[PDB]
């Protein structure tokens, strides 16, 4: 099991309170109590940021819920505070999640006086953590499976949301890690991995070989498309392209392997052999191009066991004609997976610190 996850973007500390407190004492002549509490709620928000984006990596629902709360909050402050009028005086500075920058200098960083920029990088890190937690799961466990599937789908919908909104909200030119191309590709990757998780669920629940094959076939479409978005690009870490190329072939081999079990059941012995030969070729390709990144050895043995047994009996008993691949029906596609929409609130039991404002 080799899953892709995304590193969180780094940020630097900001005093959210100082510039927010000072811009609350406006309309609101109440230099007394009520108005001067909405200014300690802005202390809670500044502390919340330090919590969401400042603490050393924690990989629990603990740390993700913090992040998602922080995102929820930032979004409900945008009507409260003048920022695409701006107006207020906050600068958020974030490093690019991927571009190391030249060691002939420093990071690739981008400072902007924008709530838009802030929420985008926050959402990014919500997606990235979600992907880390999904990739962490023990997939030999039904609840591990379920947490991976839920989180890959969240991460997919949240990268996609950034794709539709980064440019609108930034005004300026985004950094390449959050730009629509990188992030549309990360969305498709998480969604591929979500599908792969359903394939593994079905494997585990020993479902109908026909079901499993369509689930694997659709995964191969998703992984196919993601590697093709990466073919001419060097934005993501270097392990990403070869993993996606490998998975695209592994997924196709799983499709053919399970479709072969169905053919056999149906006494279509020639078709079984044809599909198994396709599987073995795919898996032979991956074993020789991509061995630094996946271990395909037990699958390969399993295919070779089935193909050796298949050929021996067809030659000695059935004499079925082994058909050509272009003459076989296509394996269908079952998609069980979508990009979770970002609809605030995204956090568990949210309350806006500035609700009655």
């Amino acid at each position: 099991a080799t899953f892709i996850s995304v590193q969180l973007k780094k940020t630097s500390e900001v005093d959210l309170a100082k510039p927010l407190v000072k811009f609350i004492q406006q309309t609101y002549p109440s230099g007394g109590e009520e108005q001067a509490q909405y200014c300690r709620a802005a202390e809670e928000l500044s502390k919340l940021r330090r919590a969401a984006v400042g603490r050393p990596l924690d990989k629990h629902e603990g740390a993700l819920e913090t992040l998602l709360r922080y995102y929820d909050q930032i979004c409900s402050i945008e009507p409260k505070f003048p920022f695409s009028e701006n107006q207020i005086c906050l600068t958020f500075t974030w490093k690019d999640a991927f571009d190391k920058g030249s060691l002939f200098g420093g990071s690739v960083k981008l400072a902007l006086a924008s709530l838009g920029y802030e929420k985008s990088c926050v959402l990014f890190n919500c997606a990235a953590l979600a992907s880390q937690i999904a990739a962490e799961q023990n997939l030999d466990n039904d609840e591990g499976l379920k947490i991976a599937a839920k989180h890959y789908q969240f991460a997919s919908g949240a990268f996609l949301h950034i794709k539709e909104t980064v440019l609108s909200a930034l005004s300026r030119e985004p950094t390449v890690d959050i730009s629509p191309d990188t992030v549309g590709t990360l969305s498709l990757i998480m969604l591929a991995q979500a599908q792969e998780v359903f394939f593994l669920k079905a494997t585990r629940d020993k479902m109908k070989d026909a079901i499993i094959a369509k689930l694997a076939n659709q995964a191969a479409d998703y992984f196919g498309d993601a590697f093709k978005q990466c073919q001419y690009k060097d934005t993501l870490p270097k392990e990403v392209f070869p993993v996606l190329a490998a998975k695209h072939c592994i997924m196709q081999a799983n499709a053919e392997y399970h479709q072969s079990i169905l053919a056999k059941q149906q006494k279509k012995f020639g078709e079984e052999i044809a599909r198994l030969q396709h599987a073995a070729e795919l898996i032979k390709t991956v074993a020789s191009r991509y061995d630094e990144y996946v271990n395909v050895k037990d699958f390969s043995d399993k295919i070779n066991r089935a193909l050796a047994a298949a050929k021996k009996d067809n030659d000695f008993i059935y004499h079925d004609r082994v058909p050509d691949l272009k003459d076989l029906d296509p394996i269908g596609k079952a998609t069980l997976v979508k990009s979770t929409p970002v609809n605030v609130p995204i956090s568990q039991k949210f309350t806006d610190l500035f609700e009655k404002m």
């Binding site: 379920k146 599937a149 839920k150 789908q153 359903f198 669920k201 079905a202 479902m207 109908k208 026909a210 079901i211 079952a334 069980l336």
Partner: peptide, 13 residues
């Protein structure tokens, strides 16, 4: 065959 498919869709729910 989309019967066992709904009973997969509604697991992650």
């Amino acid at each position: 065959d989309e019967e066992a498919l709904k009973q997969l869709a509604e697991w992650v729910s």
